[PDB]
Paper text:
Bromodomains (BRDs) are protein interaction modules that specifically recognize ε-N-lysine acetylation motifs, a key event in the reading process of epigenetic marks. The 61 BRDs in the human genome cluster into eight families based on structure/sequence similarity. Despite large sequence variations, all BRD modules share a conserved fold that comprises a left-handed bundle of four α helices (αZ, αA, αB, αC), linked by loop regions of variable length (ZA and BC loops), which line the Kac binding site and determine binding specificity. The four helices form a deep cavity that is extended by the two loop regions (ZA and BC loops), creating a largely hydrophobic Kac binding pocket.
Cocrystal structures with peptides have demonstrated that Kac is recognized by a central deep hydrophobic cavity, where it is anchored by a hydrogen bond to an asparagine residue present in most BRDs (Owen et al., 2000). For example, the KD of CREBBP decreased from 733 μM for H3K14ac to 131 μM for H3pS10K14acK18ac suggesting that many BRDs recognize a pattern of modifications rather than a single Kac mark.
Residue numbers in the entry: 1083 to 1197
The structure:
Amino acid sequence: KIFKPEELRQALMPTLEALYRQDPESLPFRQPVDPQLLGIPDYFDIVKNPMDLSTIKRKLDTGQYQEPWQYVDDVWLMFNNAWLYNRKTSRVYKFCSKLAEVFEQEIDPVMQSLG
């Protein structure tokens, strides 16, 4: 019913690690999209709620998720931003799809264990 922050973090962290461990597929996701540096000023017109692995880890590390679904929501947010913004055959889009494949395989038992 109520989750202890360090147990939530401990349960969920392996699924985040699984994504980080994807090389090269995690690489575009390990840090926030910076549209200024990238010269893509349209990015925040399309992606209103940016999300990336570094931000997810920080939130997981600083008790910012009270329930497991808020974490799942952020991972899906990351994916959905990338699938909306990028070409289907782009490196980023293909990479994202791999992260989603890994995440689907990792999350389901963890959500089962958590209740």
